[PDB]
């Protein structure tokens, strides 16, 4: 399969050509579940410098890597075999980068759950990831303005929710295959708004396009998990490593807001014959923002983002020191107070 590739304008203004481009992006998601966006030389350089920083860090001993954790934020290191998909432990090691807030930030002083400084392994890694995430965020904002325009919505519909958004990134290393087992991460959908993915030259990501007649679960609802669904049935598209692109697909919150006009793209990762580096960037609402259905005016359903994120991470990392401190200090009470 050959994915569609688009060049984004540096600024999105709402002109008729922006609307036409936004419609094309929507159509590509509706047909293929994903598309490529071309990177310029600086976007590409920052991508490769982030991957190199990841490779260096992963070569450190586990004793050091394990120390890169915080009891205030979920940012930092997750060893291989700690995450689980459809009840089966997954293979990659992960460094998650959430908003990097100093202890002087008023949200950290107030003890809001999940708010705190990233436990960076070193300053060179910090700089590489921050620079990369700066570019990824500018692309995310362009994409969300184009998506709104394509649906004939106010240009600001999504970006109003993503001001100081809770953007975060999974910095991943998958091991080489070491047995007959090759499921690096099982089939799932991502819980957030918009996903921008980058990878090295190795290969291993597969995505599922929309399928006529196929029922899709609403993974934000209890009892409608998308985990494991379709894992052993076609169609799955291999996301071929390609120089000079990132890929982009919708998450669960875009499926919710669009009432299923966009579907959260199912994806899975196969272990390759050598290690694979990748980054998955989530462009998200503000922690205090609530997503809402755009095309169902009288629907009362909402997704309060900070509640959604906090509950997800507490369930996914239930023994992490971050979760223990939330429980010990009753930090979920702050969430109720904010709402
Ligand atoms: Mn994912």
> What does the DSSP assignment read for 216-267?
---TTSTT---TTTTTTSS--EE----TTEEEEEE-HHHHHHTTTSS-PPPE
CA 222 to centroid of ligand 1, rounded, Å: 18
Instruction: Point out the annotated binding site.
Output: 188, 267
Determine the Cα–Cα distance for residues 281 and 259; give it in Å rounded to an integer: 23
CA 250 to centroid of ligand 1, rounded, Å: 11
The H-or-E segment that residue 183 falls in is strand 183-188
CA 230 to centroid of ligand 1, rounded, Å: 15
Judge whether 119 and 68 are in contact, CB under 8 Å.
yes
CA 280 to centroid of ligand 1, rounded, Å: 7
Contacts of 279 (CB under 8 A, 6+ apart): 47, 50, 51, 54, 132, 169, 170, 171, 172, 197, 198, 199
Determine the Cα–Cα distance for residues 218 and 226; give it in Å rounded to an integer: 7
State how beta strands 194-199 and 183-188 pair: unpaired
> What does the DSSP assignment read for 253-316?
HHHHHTTTSS-PPPEEEE--SS-EEEEEEEE---TT-EE--SS-TT----EEHHHHHHHHHHHH
Say if residue 4 is exposed, middle or buried (CB neighbours under 10 Å; 0-12, 13-18, 19+).
middle
CA 11 to centroid of ligand 1, rounded, Å: 28
Instruction: Point out the annotated binding site for Fe cation.
Output: 188, 267
Determine the Cα–Cα distance for residues 251 and 219; give it in Å rounded to an integer: 10
Locate 301 and state its tokens.
């359903």
Place of tokens 């993915």: 197
Determine the Cα–Cα distance for residues 106 and 91; give it in Å rounded to an integer: 37
CA 190 to centroid of ligand 1, rounded, Å: 5
Cα 138–chain centre separation: 15
Determine the Cα–Cα distance for residues 335 and 304; give it in Å rounded to an integer: 10
Q: Using alpha carbons, select from 283, 229, 278, 295 the residue that is nearest to residue 253.
A: 283
DSSP annotation of 181 reads -
CA 189 to centroid of ligand 1, rounded, Å: 6
Judge whether 117 and 101 are in contact, CB under 8 Å.
yes
Determine the Cα–Cα distance for residues 298 and 316; give it in Å rounded to an integer: 33
Helix, strand or coil for residue 172?
A: strand
CA 85 to centroid of ligand 1, rounded, Å: 10
CA 71 to centroid of ligand 1, rounded, Å: 24
CA 263 to centroid of ligand 1, rounded, Å: 14
Cα dist from 260 to 27, 132, 219, 263, 266, whole Å: 13, 31, 12, 5, 14
The technique is X-ray
Place of tokens 């199912």: 266
CA 228 to centroid of ligand 1, rounded, Å: 12
Determine the Cα–Cα distance for residues 81 and 92; give it in Å rounded to an integer: 7
Locate 221 and state its tokens.
């609802």
Cα dist from 233 to 12, 70, 91, 126, 211, whole Å: 39, 40, 22, 40, 12
> What does the DSSP assignment read for 80-121?
TTS-EETTEE---EEEEE--B--TTSHHHHTT-TT-B----S
CA 269 to centroid of ligand 1, rounded, Å: 9
Judge whether 46 and 128 are in contact, CB under 8 Å.
yes
Determine the Cα–Cα distance for residues 192 and 76; give it in Å rounded to an integer: 19
> First and final CA of the chain: distance in angstroms?
45
Place of tokens 């991943």: 172
Judge whether 246 and 140 are in contact, CB under 8 Å.
no
CA 312 to centroid of ligand 1, rounded, Å: 13
């Amino acid at each position: 399969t050959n994915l569609q590739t688009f060049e984004l304008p540096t600024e999105v203004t709402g002109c008729a050509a922006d609307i036409s481009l936004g419609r094309a992006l929507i159509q590509a998601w509706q047909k293929d579940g994903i598309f490529q966006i071309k990177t310029d030389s600086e976007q590409d350089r920052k991508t490769q410098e982030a991957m190199a920083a990841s490779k260096q860090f992963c070569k450190e001993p586990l004793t050091f890597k394990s120390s890169c954790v915080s009891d205030l934020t979920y940012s930092g290191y997750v060893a291989s075999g700690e995450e689980v998909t459809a009840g089966k432990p997954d293979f990659p090691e992960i460094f998650t980068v959430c908003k990097d807030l100093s202890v002087g930030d008023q949200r950290v002083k107030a003890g809001w759950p999940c708010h705190g400084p990233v436990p960076w392994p070193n300053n060179t890694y910090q700089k590489s990831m921050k620079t990369f995430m700066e570019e990824l965020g500018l692309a995310g904002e362009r994409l969300l303005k184009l998506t709104a325009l394509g649906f004939e919505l106010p240009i600001n519909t999504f970006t109003d929710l993503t001001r100081d958004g809770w953007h975060h990134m999974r910095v991943l290393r998958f091991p080489p295959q070491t047995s007959t087992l090759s499921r690096g991460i099982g089939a799932h959908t991502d819980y957030g708004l918009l996903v921008i993915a980058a990878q090295d030259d190795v290969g291993g990501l597969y995505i599922r396009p929309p399928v006529e007649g196929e029922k899709r679960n609403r993974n934000w609802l209890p009892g409608e998990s998308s985990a494991g669904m379709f894992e052993h049935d076609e169609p799955w598209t291999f996301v071929t490593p390609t120089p000079g692109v990132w890929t982009v697909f919708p998450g669960d919150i875009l499926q919710f807001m669009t009432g299923g006009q966009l579907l959260s793209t199912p994806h899975k990762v196969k272990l390759n014959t050598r290690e694979r580096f990748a980054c998955a960037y989530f462009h998200e609402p503000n922690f205090e923002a609530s997503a809402y259905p755009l095309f169902e005016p009288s629907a009362n359903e909402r997704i309060h983002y900070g509640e959604h994120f906090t509950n997800m991470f507490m369930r996914c990392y239930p023994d992490r020191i971050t979760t223990q401190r939330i429980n010990k200090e009753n930090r979920l009470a702050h969430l109720e107070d904010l709402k």
